[PDB]
Amino acid sequence: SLVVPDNFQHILRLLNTNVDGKVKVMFAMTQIKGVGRRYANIVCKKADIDMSKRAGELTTEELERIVTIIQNPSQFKIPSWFLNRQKDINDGKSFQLLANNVDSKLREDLERLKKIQTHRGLRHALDLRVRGQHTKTTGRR
Amino acid sequence: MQSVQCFGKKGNATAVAHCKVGKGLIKVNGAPLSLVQPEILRMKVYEPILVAGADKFAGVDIRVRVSGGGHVSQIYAIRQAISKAIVAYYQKFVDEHSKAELKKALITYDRTLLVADPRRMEPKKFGGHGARARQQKSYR
Amino acid sequence: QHATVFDKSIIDRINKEVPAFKFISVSVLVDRMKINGSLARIAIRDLAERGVIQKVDQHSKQAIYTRVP
Amino acid sequence: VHRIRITLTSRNVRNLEKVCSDLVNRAKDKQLRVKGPVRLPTKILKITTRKTPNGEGSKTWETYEMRIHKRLIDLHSPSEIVKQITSIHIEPGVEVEVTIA
Amino acid sequence: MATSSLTPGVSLDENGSIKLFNKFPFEGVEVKDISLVDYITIGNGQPLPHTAGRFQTKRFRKARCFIVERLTNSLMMNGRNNGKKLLATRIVKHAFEIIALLTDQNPLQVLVDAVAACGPREDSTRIGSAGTVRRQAVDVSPLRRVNQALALITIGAREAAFRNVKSISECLAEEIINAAKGSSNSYAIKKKDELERVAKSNR
Amino acid sequence: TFAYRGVELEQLLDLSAEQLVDLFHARARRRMLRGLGPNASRFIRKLRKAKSEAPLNEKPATVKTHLRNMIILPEMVGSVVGIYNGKLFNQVEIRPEMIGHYLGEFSITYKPTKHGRPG
Amino acid sequence: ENVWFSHPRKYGKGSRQCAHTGRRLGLIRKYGLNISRQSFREYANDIGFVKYR
RNA sequence: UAACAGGUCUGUGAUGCCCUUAGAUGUUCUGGGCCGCACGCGCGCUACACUGACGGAGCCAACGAGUUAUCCUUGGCCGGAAGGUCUGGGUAAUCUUGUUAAACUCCGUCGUGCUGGGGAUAGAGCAUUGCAAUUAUUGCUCUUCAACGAGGAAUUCCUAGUAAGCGCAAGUCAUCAGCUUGCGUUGAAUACGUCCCUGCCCUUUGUACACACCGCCC
Ligand SMILES: [Zn+2]
């Protein structure tokens, strides 16, 4: 139903991460940190690329347009209610979470909660659960 | 006139029919006997039709309504309802010997089509979720 | 592992290997060749409109096909 | 024009039947379209509780039952006969109510 | 002849052909292996394996149950699927039609030969009561032979298809065809041989 | 110049109440949406007394109360309050950095962890 | 006429109880009974809760 | 029928006795709590995958509850079904309600790899219930999305609509089911045997036991 002798260029570096070459695009995009399942589906649908083809047959123009749409989701008529981060603490806007930035956002949030010295902060320092859970029988080892 | 009525149950399922004189037009709740909710549960409904053939059914018009029970309960109810409706029609409007041979033929090849099925679930007793199943004792 | 590179060989192979067997489905083609699942049903669908395979009874999980005779 | 509907709710089967028989007999003594008794589904309330005042002991649960029975009667009687039959139908344990409009 | 309802001629032709199975003949199949007659209802033709009836009320009421139904009942294993008869019926139907596609003979005949060959002849019960806790060679009844064959076939199919691409129906069909004949590639036959050899060893 | 949403601390000190209640977490903003110091208005006024009495120090003269279930607000921030954790009026030293969270989220009431392990 | 003595309530505990009970544990409000389980057991027959089954 | 030295003096204006009563072992308002953990033991739950997951679509039950100020909910409309809007049905087999359920089935994908099976665990906002939800009630939009890859020795329940699996109703409730009590659907194999392991009754017999073998005694 599709052209068999197509182009393949294995994997490529993307957002300081590796996107699988011979793998379905839905599976491959989950390798990028900060990407789920519905998020991957909607961004690809808004990027308007053929779903049957995998990530190994994509071209430079399609790859660049897809990532730019991901870099600027809200500008491309992507609804803001879906966005993971809305009304950021520092930015003050509904900034989109990525892979390279979340590699340091977790520790940035940790220092945010530790410098101000909350009860949640000492729970994080002592490696205990922060929600009102129970550890009398569970939460062991 | 020539018409009878009957019903059929398999526990918490009921199916009441209304026989009439006609030239076919056999259906099960709007849809015909061919089209039903399941697909692997079709021959169960077809069980009493094939035994006597369709020539005897060419002179009867029956539409049966089904209400209550699960999928297997409903298909058993409708096949029981149509079978008892047919034998009621042939008991009241054709020779007794013909009814005797039809009922005997149905009895010989009977998946509880005519005889009622007294199947019920025993009440749940305290001490466990099931009537007989009980929570395990730590014995120590 | 199962290969998925469309190197022009799989399409010709399956088109010349369908007459080898009668029952064609995902379970048997996995044994026949290293097929990753997508082409498993895509190729069957693309060969359905051809007279090589005759349908018998289709289901959501699998469909039954037979040869020309 | 003036239809009288009276309630026959109670729990004692014998006394509600006696009240129902009395009004039906009067409705047959004087022809008022001779509308007979009407029976409603039983409203049974099921409650399950424990038996042990404390927590020690085996898991035993006691289930109690509370059922009530309702009947309705429609009559074409005039006001004077309606007030008369209600006067003679004073029985213990029977609750009656008449709706006019 | 037809009525307003479609009434496909397949059902009429099936009735004309003394009500054969779903897609296989019923007249012409019998148990050929000796010592297992009067306990398998091959002649009892039923359009569907399922039959919601009483199969345990009597001591030997189980002997009159349909062999296909008993196998679907055995396939009801794995309490994840305890109670899903529709899945078992579809698997059995798919296995039976695959067997017919593979070999031209009646899949019911394949099934009867398979259970007959798998059924153990000599077992070894335990004497118990402490002491030497040895075992003695004992023969078994035909009804228990069918029970062992059904259980061994089902457990072998589950073990074979527990983690693999092949479908449960395909694995069940492969087990049935491999057990109907002597190829030494059947897990049920292997357990049959193992039970026989340990029984002769402790005899 | 940045406490919760990047708006400057001086601006928060006299910002619009609706804007302040709108720049918070849904939980932390529904808290002030439905409850604004129930009987704690006296506590707010008493803190205003402390600010007027001792503005020279970052923490004015200590003032006690018996309630912490409300988040901190810019017009009341910058003081020390005595809160009964059960046997002691803990000094709390409210700071404007964490505007939008209760006082118990930052103080200690029960023995948290570590099994104690005395000697 | 007393301030900070008895706090008025409209929901939760401190709003409903029985005439001679109100332990709030092991108490049913079903059908507006508002009585303890032990009292219900003692006077079940008088109300009409008869162990038919 | 009798036996437990069984539980409940924290259901009980049911109570005998000991103690206290003003700096009250009396009433009451606020904060911390019964839920606080380097562990051992329980009763139940989740997946360990294709028998599943996702996505559309045809649809098949029962028992039960509800406002006198203040509960069960329909209809047009707005929405991020999390809410709120206004006329409104219901003191009741007349309104929720015919509690169009789940399981199932027609079709497409995930192809067998701790992955799109499994959501332990961490973060940001969206609403109702409640002087008000920190020690996140509850669900919601998401992201990070791990152990586990049918579990040893031991041990528990089960004889036909039985186990098993699934869902629903009610209890406690201002809110919150992973518990309990009932209902219905899908629906099996195994025995019609025994005292062999583990106990209960009867008869005979023996006894230096009689708080009675967890006994007496050298
Ligand atoms: Zn009480």
**Among E12, E173, E37, CA closest to E116:** E37
- Give the number of other CB atoms < 10 A from CB of residue B111: 19
Interatomic CA distance for residues B101 and E87, integer angstroms: 38
Interatomic CA distance for residues A136 and B17, integer angstroms: 62
Q: Which residues pair with A12 in a beta bridge?
A: A19
Q: How far is the CA of F33 from the C1' of H193 (A)?
A: 75
Q: Which residue has the tokens 């002991």?
A: D57
Task: Enumerate residues 6+ apart whose C-beta is below 8 A from A84.
Answer: A34, A39, A96, A97
**Among B24, B20, B29, B10, CA closest to B85:** B20
**Among G41, A100, C23, CA closest to E170:** C23
Question: In the structure encoding, which two tokens stand for residue C24, read together?
Answer: 């064609």
Question: In the structure encoding, which two tokens stand for residue B71, read together?
Answer: 């999928």
Q: Is residue B119 classed as helix, strand or coil in its secondary structure?
A: coil
Question: In the structure encoding, which two tokens stand for residue D65, read together?
Answer: 């039952």
Measured distance between the N- and C-terminal CA atoms of chain D, rounded to whole angstroms: 10
Question: In the structure encoding, which two tokens stand for residue G2, read together?
Answer: 């007393």
Q: How far is the CA of E92 from the C1' of H51 (A)?
A: 13
Q: What is the helix (H) or strand (E) element at residue E198, kind and residue range?
A: helix E187-202
CB D44 within 8 A of CB D66: yes
**Interval between CA G49 and ligand 1 midpoint (Å):** 18
Q: Where are the beta strands (DSSP E) in D1-101?
A: 4-7, 38-39, 43-50, 61-68, 71-75, 98-99
Q: Is residue G50 classed as helix, strand or coil in its secondary structure?
A: strand
CB B80 within 8 A of CB B50: no
Question: Among the residues of A4-131, which ranges form H helices?
Answer: 25-30, 38-47, 60-71, 102-115, 119-125
For C3-29, the three-class secondary structure string (H helix, E strand, C coil) is CCCCCCHHHHHHHHHHHHCCCCCHHHH
CA B37 to chain centre: 16
Question: In the structure encoding, which two tokens stand for residue A29, read together?
Answer: 């995009």
Interface test with D, best of G21, G30, G41, G47 (most D CBs within 10 A): G41
Interatomic CA distance for residues E69 and A77, integer angstroms: 58
Interatomic CA distance for residues C14 and C47, integer angstroms: 10
Interatomic CA distance for residues F73 and F100, integer angstroms: 7
Residue E147 in contact with partner chain B when CB distance is under 8 A:
no
**Interval between CA D65 and ligand 1 midpoint (Å):** 21
Q: How far is the CA of A60 from the C1' of H34 (A)?
A: 64
Q: Is the CB of D59 under 7 A from strand H?
A: yes
Sign of the alpha-carbon torsion through B113, B118, B124, B129: negative
DSSP character at residue D82: H
**Interval between CA F70 and ligand 1 midpoint (Å):** 37
- Give the number of other CB atoms < 10 A from CB of residue G52: 10
- Pairing outcome for strands D43-50 and D61-68: antiparallel
In this complex, how many residue pairs, one in chain B and one in chain E, have their CB atoms less than 8 Å apart? Answer: 66
Question: In the structure encoding, which two tokens stand for residue A33, read together?
Answer: 């940190």
CB B58 within 8 A of CB B20: no
Sign of the alpha-carbon torsion through G35, G38, G43, G44: positive
Residues 95-124 of A with CB under 7 A from strand H: 97, 102, 106, 109, 113, 118-120, 123-124
Q: Which residue has the tokens 């806007």?
A: A93
CB A33 within 8 A of CB A99: yes
Interatomic CA distance for residues C39 and C34, integer angstroms: 10
Interatomic CA distance for residues A24 and A55, integer angstroms: 6
Q: Is the CB of A88 under 7 A from strand H?
A: yes
Question: Among the residues of E20-119, which ranges form H helices?
Answer: 67-74, 85-102, 107-118
DSSP character at residue A56: G
Residues 41-100 of F with CB under 8 A from A: 95, 97-98
CB D1 within 8 A of CB D70: no
Interatomic CA distance for residues E10 and A134, integer angstroms: 64
Inter-CA distances, E73 with E65, E89, G19, Å: 11, 10, 60
**Residue B19 corresponds to which amino acid?**
C
Task: Enumerate residues 6+ apart whose C-beta is below 8 A from C12.
Answer: none
Measured distance between the N- and C-terminal CA atoms of chain B, rounded to whole angstroms: 76
Inter-CA distances, E51 with B12, E62, E85, E86, E186, Å: 18, 13, 11, 12, 29
Q: What is the helix (H) or strand (E) element at residue C41, kind and residue range?
A: helix C38-48
**Interval between CA G35 and ligand 1 midpoint (Å):** 7
Residues of A in contact with C5 (CB under 8 A): 8, 22, 56
As a 3-state breakdown, chain A gives helix, strand, coil percent values, each rounded to 5, of: 40, 5, 55
Measured distance between the N- and C-terminal CA atoms of chain E, rounded to whole angstroms: 67
Interatomic CA distance for residues E21 and E49, integer angstroms: 9
CB A34 within 8 A of CB A50: no
Question: In the structure encoding, which two tokens stand for residue C21, read together?
Answer: 């067997």
Interface test with C, best of E164, E167, E169, E172 (most C CBs within 10 A): E167
Question: Angle at CA B74, nearest 5°, toward B68 and B77?
Answer: 100
**CB nearest G37 (choices: D11, D45, D50):** D50
Q: Is residue F115 classed as helix, strand or coil in its secondary structure?
A: coil
Task: Enumerate residues 6+ apart whose C-beta is below 8 A from B59.
Answer: B21, B22, B23
In chain A, the residue whose alpha carbon lies closest to the alpha carbon of C4 is A22
**Residue B59 corresponds to which amino acid?**
G
**Among C25, E168, E50, CA closest to B38:** E50
CB E156 within 8 A of CB E175: yes
CB F79 within 8 A of CB F63: yes
**Among E107, E100, E75, CA closest to E89:** E75
Experimental method of this PDB entry: cryo-EM
Q: What is the helix (H) or strand (E) element at residue A45, kind and residue range?
A: helix A38-47
Question: In the structure encoding, which two tokens stand for residue C23, read together?
Answer: 């029952």
Question: In the structure encoding, which two tokens stand for residue E203, read together?
Answer: 């005899």
Inter-CA distances, B98 with B57, B105, D35, E191, F86, Å: 14, 10, 47, 55, 94
Task: Enumerate residues 6+ apart whose C-beta is below 8 A from E161.
Answer: E167, E168, E170, E171, E172
Q: Is residue D6 classed as helix, strand or coil in its secondary structure?
A: strand
Q: Where are the beta strands (DSSP E) in E41-86?
A: none
Task: Enumerate residues 6+ apart whose C-beta is below 8 A from D62.
Answer: D48, D49, D50, D51, G41, G51
Question: Half-sphere exposure (CA, 13 Å, Cβ side) for D91?
Answer: 20
Residues 34-63 of A with CB under 7 A from strand H: 34-39
For E87-102, the three-class secondary structure string (H helix, E strand, C coil) is HHHHHHHHHHHHHHHH
Q: Which residue has the tokens 């057990």?
A: E179
CB E86 within 8 A of CB B33: no
Question: Among the residues of chain F, which ranges form H helices?
Answer: 9-13, 17-22, 26-34, 41-53
Check D64 against G51: CB less than 8 A apart.
yes
Resolution of the experimentally solved model in angstroms: 2.4
- Give the number of other CB atoms < 10 A from CB of residue E11: 19
Interatomic CA distance for residues C48 and C28, integer angstroms: 17
- Pairing outcome for strands F63-64 and F81-84: parallel
Q: Is residue E143 classed as helix, strand or coil in its secondary structure?
A: helix
CB E40 within 8 A of CB E71: no
